[PDB]
Design goal:
This is part of a larger assembly, with four copies of chain A.
Chain A (H helix, E strand, L loop, with lengths): L1 H12 L2 H8 L1 H16 L5 H35 L7 H30 L8 H26 L1 H7 L3 H17 L1 H13 L2 H6 L12 E4 L9 H15 L7 E3 L19 E4 L12 H11 L9 E2 L1 H10 L6 E7 L2 H15 L7 E4 L5 E8 L1 H6 L4 H11 L7 E4 L2 E4 L12 H4 L4 E2 L5 E2 L5 E8 L3 E4 L4 E7 L5 H14 L7 E7 H31 L2 H8 L2 H15 L5 H31 L12 H9 L5 H13 L2 H5 L5 H34 L1
Antiparallel strand pairs in A: 1-3, 1-4, 2-3, 5-14, 5-15, 6-14, 7-12, 8-9, 10-11
Helix pairs in contact in A: 1-2, 1-4, 1-24, 2-4, 3-4, 3-6, 4-5, 4-6, 4-24, 5-6, 5-7, 5-19, 5-22, 8-26, 9-26, 19-20, 19-22, 20-26, 21-22, 21-26, 22-23, 22-26
PDB class: membrane protein, transport protein
Keywords: pump, heavy metal. copper, membrane protein
Entry title: Cryo-electron microscopy structure of the heavy metal efflux pump CusA in the symmetric closed state
Chain lengths: ~675, ~100, ~250, ~50
């Protein structure tokens, strides 16, 4: 990004030392940002560096503007007086005057950017913790850049073909626009109204699928399997997963590790598949196709396959508890009603075209061998309840009795009967019982043993039983399938008194972030308007240039639709950031145009029917002011194209945040170039 | 998030008994801790886990210090041999390195 | 009661008292154990109600059990309700009274009766077998449920003879535990009631609103004839004071 | 400095037993406390200080 920005600056100014003066603002801004975030206590991660990479161009624009202005002033001075006659005194004077002529506007523009992206600190929770560092570092970098531009840049600027084509292409369009401004504003309104077409096709999700070098495999199955069978299933599924050429290691495991952070019982597979470096396969096999091949290769009837990254999966399980991205919780107080409702919902969900699989957790899926100890019979032989259940807690059981020490180690002891006495319930009814009377009897003479069903594990959220339903959909959108499931389970499934249904997982966080972003726009607009009145001291110009963000939004959403991205929190942040850049471009344009209209033409209008010289002032404000705007737009787009076309680690979020800004910086400036002069001419009359 | 794990062992007790005598008094007691956002909890044939997730902007150690008090307050009601032990100072996302 | 200096954190004090509690626990008697108090004080008694039954049907011992085992748990879930206490009523108690004359005839001492009574209320099964198809968990009964179970336990086994049952030395019955608190309404008679205690440093109006909403939405699940009559409510004073101050400011 | 003392009593146990069963699990556990600079510890015929 730094290299490309330097190249663009050197190609636009065609002066090496000017390019150096322009780019020296980036390293010092980076240094200031790093110092401030070290003082605060942040570390270097994807978000911080992403914020700095996003702020690169927004911090170089203000310096290149002043550099171009000083260039023009020096050129004019040289054109006025003979060459080969100069000294440091007059040069320093003219450079300082040229810098002061345009400093305040760009300073207030950088302040606009900063304090208009500041309102994103209101995010709370997962998205807040994710986007905190980004906003922090972006604000720090922009503040340092503004400080340097208003303090340091003049000093080292005083110490140290293409535009003709732009003018030739701009002249006639500008004239024909100034001829009729009303029709121009009308076609602008229509170009804003034509935004409703892509908004429907753009999807919706919480966050992009940030892919890493590994991925988890956690299938859902019934708890009715043994230990040896579970180990055999693990072995066969691991050997089947290893059959894919993009797998280096496979470490499968069932049950739990010896830690409190793992509560998984047996019958629950959790494998960690390690993928080879992506430089070891055909450059056309993405992660989605690898997941598809894995899903198609390890069918293994009896499992509901699920593939997710480790970090994201564990963060989801921590924040919500549902491993899958989409999930439905059925609450209530009765277990039978909850189980029936979960079964119904699970059976209805797998008919949605986008869903790939759906599985509900059963509550009553546990087999019990109930031994009702009759107290009358147990008393007839003279033995308490404890004495008759010791024959099943220790003989048929094997509970621990103690532990032996060996240096530092310790190992437990067991005690139980042989295996031939726990074969079948009929083998229990024949258990030999040595009564306290030193007698021989069976277990059927003192207790009735039968087989039944009941709860295997009781999950309760907020002290209320709940049943979770895991949904898996990889082909269709997230919000689309969520709305489809809502409609389906609200149409063809009837509720029962005492039970509720709630969508959880990514959808709750998505809705929270959506509400926050929806209520966050007014603050940004108000800050922009305040800082604009602070610079132009008029409400007219403030509203004039603040009415330019809609074009930016239209362009951003169009580019989002064109690139195939979905609407998420990253795109929201992108729009909240693009608003400020659009406002900054409008400020620059209107400031230059205003100086133009202020200098010459304040004399002819008092004589009515005088519009010939009013257009020449606008022309002058669109002949001398064409290079700065083109340069700002070029550097803004060039400092963002790299992170847009980037394909690496963590590039998903940055590309999603950059796409809206690059989309808007092509539509808002191109339209502003014709809407600002038109509306300003209309306002001056 | 800020999560505290409470793991209790009840040797050989059907899920319903361990849920009535161990998990319920813990899930209903931890909901009164200052700053507790939610309290998940599930009991198995011999164990009972309770996850207390707190609000945003809460000190990771203030939460443990405040959960210890309610643990002491509820210890007087648990069964004879049952004892609720606090979890480690890490979470599920803390699994950094794994070897075989 | 330990009262601290001014400007002290309400939680720092508890955290510092816990340490000295641990330090002194090693010196207390065998079975004594010092338990910390709730997170509220005496001034935290925000809301108080009484469970009335104008039908002469539900006895005094049922109202208190209903309170303790339903409302103490339904209201305790409110965000900032530090505690819910029960006042008045009667607690159900299994009283086994022994006759000296009939106890001497059999020649049994009280120690054996006690050891046999307190050794038949365990429930634990810690095995796991396989039925040739899948896992099979193991249970074991042992909980005491009804009264006849108390008369069906044997104290000593007579070799080839009628063993002595608890029904032979001691008769069982239900009774009221020694009452520690008595409550009563206007002039009618004793009544069981509850007391909501708020956490120190939180707003009372929101807690009262939530408590009233829950007690209202629970009015359908209560038995027929039982009603909850409020005896003390602090929201009325809050409303009156706020209205008075607002009117004063306006005038 | 900020020092915390942990005194444990094991009646009548040779220094090695009290060091293996009492002092070692304490010295190795207290080294994970946030902010613990060092953890000294020694066990005697009946006691263990950390």
């Amino acid at each position: 990004e730094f290299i490309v920005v330097a190249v663009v600056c050197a190609l636009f100014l065609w002066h090496v030392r000017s390019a150096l003066v322009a780019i020296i603002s980036l390293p010092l801004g980076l240094c200031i940002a790093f110092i401030v975030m070290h003082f605060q206590g942040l570390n270097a991660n994807i978000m911080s560096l992403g914020g700095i990479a996003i702020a690169v161009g927004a911090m170089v624009d203000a310096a290149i503007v002043m550099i171009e202005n000083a260039h023009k002033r020096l050129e004019e001075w040289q054109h006025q007086h003979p060459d080969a006659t100069l000294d440091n005194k007059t040069r320093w004077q003219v450079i300082t005057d040229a810098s002061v002529e345009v400093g305040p506007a760009l300073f207030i523009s950088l302040l606009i950017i900063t304090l208009s992206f500041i309102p994103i600190f209101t995010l709370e929770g997962q998205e807040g913790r994710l986007f905190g560092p980004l906003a922090f570092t972006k604000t720090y970098a922009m503040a340092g850049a503004a400080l340097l531009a208003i303090v340091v840049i003049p000093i080292l600027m005083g110490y140290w073909p293409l535009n003709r084509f732009l003018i030739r292409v701009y002249h006639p369009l500008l004239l024909k626009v100034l001829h009729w401004p009303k029709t121009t504003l009308l076609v602008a309104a229509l170009s804003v109204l034509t935004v409703l077409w892509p908004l429907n096709k753009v999807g919706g999700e919480f966050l992009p699928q940030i892919n890493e070098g590994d991925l988890l495999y956690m299938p859902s199955t019934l708890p009715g399997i043994s230990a040896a069978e579970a180990a055999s299933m693990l072995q066969k599924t691991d050997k089947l997963i290893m059959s894919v050429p993009e797998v280096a290691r496979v470490f499968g495991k069932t049950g739990k590790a010896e830690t409190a952070t793992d509560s998984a019982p047996l019958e629950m597979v959790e494998t960690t598949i390690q993928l080879k470096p992506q430089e070891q396969w055909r450059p056309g096999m993405t992660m989605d196709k690898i997941i598809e091949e894995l899903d198609n290769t390890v069918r293994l009837p009896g499992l509901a396959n699920l593939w997710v990254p480790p970090i994201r999966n564990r963060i989801d399980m921590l924040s919500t508890g549902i491993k899958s991205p989409i999930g439905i919780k059925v609450s209530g107080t009765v277990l039978a009603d909850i189980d029936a409702m979960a079964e119904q919902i699970e059976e209805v969900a797998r008919t949605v075209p986008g869903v790939a699989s759906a599985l509900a957790e059963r509550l009553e899926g546990g087999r019990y061998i109930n031994v009702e100890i009759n107290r009358e019979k147990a008393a007839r032989y003279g033995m308490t309840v404890a004495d008759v259940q010791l024959f099943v807690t220790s003989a048929v059981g094997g509970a621990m009795v103690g532990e032996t020490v060996e240096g530092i180690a310790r190992y437990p002891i067991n005690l139980r009967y042989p295996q031939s006495w726990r074969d079948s319930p009929q083998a229990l009814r024949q258990l030999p019982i040595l009564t306290p009377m030193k007698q021989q009897i069976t277990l059927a003479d003192v207790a009735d043993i039968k087989v039944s069903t009941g709860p295997s594990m009781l999950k309760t959220e907020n002290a209320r039983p709940t049943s979770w339903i895991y949904i898996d959909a990889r082909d269709r959108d997230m919000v689309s399938v969520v709305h489809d499931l809502q409609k389906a389970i609200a149409e063809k499934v009837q509720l029962k008194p005492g039970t509720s249904v709630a969508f959880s997982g990514q959808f709750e966080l998505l809705e929270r972030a959506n509400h926050k972003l929806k209520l966050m726009v007014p603050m940004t607009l108000m800050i922009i308007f305040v800082l604009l009145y602070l610079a132009f001291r008029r409400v007219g110009e403030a509203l004039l240039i603040i009415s330019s963000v809609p074009f930016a939004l239209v362009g951003g959403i169009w580019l989002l639709w064109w690139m195939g991205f979905h609407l998420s929190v990253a795109t929201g942040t992108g729009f909240i950031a693009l608003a400020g850049v659009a406002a900054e471009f409008g400020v620059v344009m209107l400031m230059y145009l205003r100086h133009a209209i202020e200098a010459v033409p304040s004399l002819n209008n008092p004589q009515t029917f005088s519009e010939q010289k009013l257009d020449e002032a606008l022309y002058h404000g669109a002949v001398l002011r064409v290079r700065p705007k083109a340069m700002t737009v070029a550097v803004i787009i060039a400092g963002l194209l790299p992170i847009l076309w980037g394909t690496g680690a963590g590039s998903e979020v940055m590309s999603r945040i950059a796409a809206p800004m690059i989309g808007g910086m092509i539509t808002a400036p191109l339209l502003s170039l014709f809407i600002i002069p038109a509306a300003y001419k209309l306002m001056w009359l | 998030d800020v999560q505290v794990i409470i793991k209790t062992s009840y040797p050989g007790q059907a899920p319903q008994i361990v849920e009535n005598q161990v998990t319920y008094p813990l899930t209903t007691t931890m909901l009164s801790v200052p700053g507790a956002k939610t309290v998940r909890g599930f009991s198995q044939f011999g164990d009972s886990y309770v996850y207390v997730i707190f609000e945003d902007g809460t000190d990771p150690y203030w939460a443990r210090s405040r959960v210890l008090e309610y643990l002491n307050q509820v210890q007087g009601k648990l069964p004879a041999g049952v004892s609720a032990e606090l979890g480690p100072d890490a979470t599920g996302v803390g699994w950094i390195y794994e070897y075989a | 009661y330990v009262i601290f200096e001014d400007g002290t954190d309400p939680y720092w004090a508890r955290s510092r008292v816990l340490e000295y509690l641990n330090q002194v626990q090693g010196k207390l008697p065998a079975g004594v154990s010092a338990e910390l108090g709730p997170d509220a004080t005496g001034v935290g008694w925000i809301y108080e109600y009484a469970l009335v039954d104008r039908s002469g049907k539900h006895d005094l011992a049922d109202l208190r059990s209903l309170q303790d085992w339903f409302l103490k748990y339904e209201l305790k879930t409110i965000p900032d309700v530090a505690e819910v206490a029960s006042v008045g009523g009667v607690v159900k108690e299994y009283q086994v009274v022994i006759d000296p004359q009939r106890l001497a005839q059999y020649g049994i001492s009280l120690a054996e009766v006690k050891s046999a009574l307190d050794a038949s209320n365990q429930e634990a099964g810690g095995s796991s077998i396989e039925l040739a198809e899948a896992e099979y968990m193991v249970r074991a009964s042992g909980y005491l449920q009804t009264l006849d179970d108390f008369n069906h336990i044997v104290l000593k086994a007579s070799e080839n003879g009628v063993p002595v049952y608890l029904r032979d030395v001691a008769k069982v019955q239900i009774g009221p535990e020694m009452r520690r608190g008595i409550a009563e309404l206007n002039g009618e008679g004793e009544v069981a009631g509850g007391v909501v205690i708020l956490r120190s440093g939180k707003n009372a109006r929101e807690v009262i609103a939530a408590v009233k909403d829950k007690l209202e939405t629970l009015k359908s699940s209560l038995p027929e004839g039982v009603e909850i009559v409020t005896t003390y409510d602090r929201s009325q004073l809050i409303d009156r004071a706020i209205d008075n101050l607002s009117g004063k400011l306006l005038e």
